Each structure stands twice: as structure tokens, then as C-alpha cells.
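Run 2-O glycosaminoglycan sulfatase through structure prediction, thanks.
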Amino acid sequence: EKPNFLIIQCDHLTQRVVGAYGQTQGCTLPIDEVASRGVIFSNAYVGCPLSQPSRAALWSGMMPHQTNVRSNSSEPVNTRLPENVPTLGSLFSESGYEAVHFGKTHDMGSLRGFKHKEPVAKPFTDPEFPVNNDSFLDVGTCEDAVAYLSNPEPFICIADFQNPHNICGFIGENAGVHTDRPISGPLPELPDNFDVEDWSNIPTPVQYICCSHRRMTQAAHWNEENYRHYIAAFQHYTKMVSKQVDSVLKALYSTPAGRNTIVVIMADHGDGMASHRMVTKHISFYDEMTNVPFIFAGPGIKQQKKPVDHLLTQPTLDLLPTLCDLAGIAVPAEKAGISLAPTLRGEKQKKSHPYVVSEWHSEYEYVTTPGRMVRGPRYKYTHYLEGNGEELYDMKKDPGERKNLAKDPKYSKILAEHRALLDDYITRSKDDYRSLKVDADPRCRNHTPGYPSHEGPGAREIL
Ligand SMILES: [Zn+2]
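Sure, done. The structure for 2-O glycosaminoglycan sulfatase is below.
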């Protein structure tokens, strides 16, 4: 019998908060239970740390400059994926699967082939944290997926949850200098990489996220207590969505279809979680935002106690071929992803990514400051057109990315070697990166570098 698939994706969800990754306890027990039956990938980099580019890319198995959906802007700034591009939904539908999608779309046409049902917001009251339509829509999504799974073959079902994206609304309610609303639970500690060591040693676009990113403008002058309350809220919205994941899985396993279902849990991108002073996602490529949870379990998938760290994976590219392989569906040769089904099955992985990549372009076209990330087996390299800025982090010895090695002459060979990987990427993927124009108004680079120095309203008000 062909397997069913349930893909659960949570917007902003991070490795740090998912207990299976070993950093934070107590926030994701239902996800951790799935992980404990299957396989989790340590190195799972998304193609862009932003929702619409990530999703347009994910469901088509392509990179953002190829879909040409490079920001969150709507039509005509970004155009829907052409109907001739194969997608996860087209491939599965054409192979006899019922393909259904619940929850957040934000796909710019890459969900073609799925039958989508729009969720309806179901409001509720939270006595300690701000909640908004992000959280209320998730209630509807959960109801929809529960109803579907409680009476389902073969099928592929996506449940696209918003949380912990309600962190964005939290930041708005706590913008600027403020005293935090008291909460009852423990107040988390700041991460080891909270502080930026040296602002002069990071790229211009990253130095001025306070100017270009509304949420960073709002948090720029936050104190340490303020950031700790941010982390608490992030954990709270994570717990909230984890309860919905539990409800969805209970529905799945309530009929005989469940045991024949492969479950995937992932995120479109992560969240700064105060690391590098960052809130949410914008411009930078640090692991908190680019390296997401990527968990599989189900029939034929052999349990692995240890996270898989010997492979570099790219969910944005790899999900489509992995699911097709598990379903016995031929993948178009042009798709650049690499099926992980052999690793999942305990069979020989004959092909793997030598490196993985992420992209930045713009958020809403106020500031266009393209960049690229290359994660090799050990080091992460970043480049930004603006100022020709570069980063180089030793991910083995400096997993917090505190120490930029790009200007250290001891690392000049390593730096060259990673520039060369970017060159290979640009060639093979037909990236127009090197020809792109920076549009970064000097008004958004007009104070001493770094967020504590930020003055004034930021790009969306000034430009
Ligand atoms: Zn600023």
C-alpha cells in the first residue's frame, strides 16, 4: 500500500525551541515524540529566511531567484509560478493522490495541485500574552485538518500553521522602551550569542537591520529583561502550536490511515530569538533563522536516536524529491534537490549536497540589498553586494557565529574555497546575483553601525 503524507509546517519555528534538538526543554513534546520514532536532520537550511520566498521555492523544489519570488511583495512585483512548472501538488495529484492544503498559503502559485481550504479565525483570550489573528487562524486550521484526517487514500495533506509567528504581534505590543507585563512561568535566559562582538566586522546590510526591518526598529532599544520576555513569548506561541500539532496527530492516528502515513515537521524559516540582537527574520543568514527543524517519521523510515549531522540538507529543495521517492513517484531531472529517502530508509545515500545555499533580496521593496549564504561541511560563508561584505564562521567551533573570520589572514584559503562554492552555485543555478542592483537608501545607513544607535522611524516611514 502506498503511504499517505502529512506535512506540518510552522512559521518561525526554530531548532532551538524544538526539544528534539537538545537545547530547550518542554515546548514541543508532541513534535519530539514524532522525532523519537524517526529521523531529524541537524543541517536543514532554507532557501531564504522569509515566508513567501521560502514557500514559493519549497513547494516547487526551486530556489528563490528561479521562481523569481524574492520578497513578500504581491503582484505585479512578484508573479505567480507558471502553470508549466511541476510542483509537489502537481506531481502527487497526477500520481493518484488526493492532495489537500490547510492553513497559511503565501505560496505565489507553488501550491498548484493542492486543493486549499482557507481557515477561519476563531478568537480566544490569553491571560498573559498578546494574541492576534495569527493564533486565531491556527485554531481554524487545526479544526480543518482534524476534520479531514478524522475521516480520510492515498493522500498528501499539508497543515500550514502560523505560530510562532504571533511573536511579530508581541514585538508591536512591546515596541520601544517599556516595562514588561509580568508573566507566571520561568523567564528564559538570553542566548550565548546575544551580543554582537564587533559591528565593524559584519556586513553593512546586517549592521542596519534596525533601519530596514520594522520589528528591529521596534526592538532596537530593548534592554535585557525586554529580550528575555521576547523569548518567553516565543516559547509560549511555540507551546500553543505544539498543542495543535498534537490535535492533528491524534486525528491522524484515529483511523487506520494513520499507521500508513509519513509525517514531516518543518518550518519555512526560523527566528532570531535575541541571538545577534535579532528579532524575527530579515537580511541575515544566522542559523537561528536559516537552519530549521526538519523531522520525518513513518512507515519504512528507520528510527535514528542521534540527529543526522553528516549530511547538509536543504528542505526548500529536498522535500519535493524526498516525498516523491518515498511515494514511488518519478522526479523531474531538472529539480536540484536530493532525495533523503535513502538515509530515511537506512539504505545507501549515493548523492548529497556538497554545500547548501540561502538568498536574500528584499522584504517589501523599500530596501533591496541582495545577499547569498553558502554552508559548506564546516564553515558558513555570506556575501552581500552592498559594500561587498563577507562573513565566514566556523560552525564546528563557533556554532553561535560570534567571530567573523573573513578578514583574518589565517582563513584566506578557507575564504577563497567558499567564494568558489558561491561561484559554482551562481553558474549551475543561473543566478543573476552578480548583475543585481543594490537599492539601499543612505537615510537607512545614517547612524553609527548597530542597533543600540538607531534613531528615528525606519524605512517604511521614511521611504
Ligand atoms: Zn538603524
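The CA atoms of residues 54 and 454 lie 29 Å apart.
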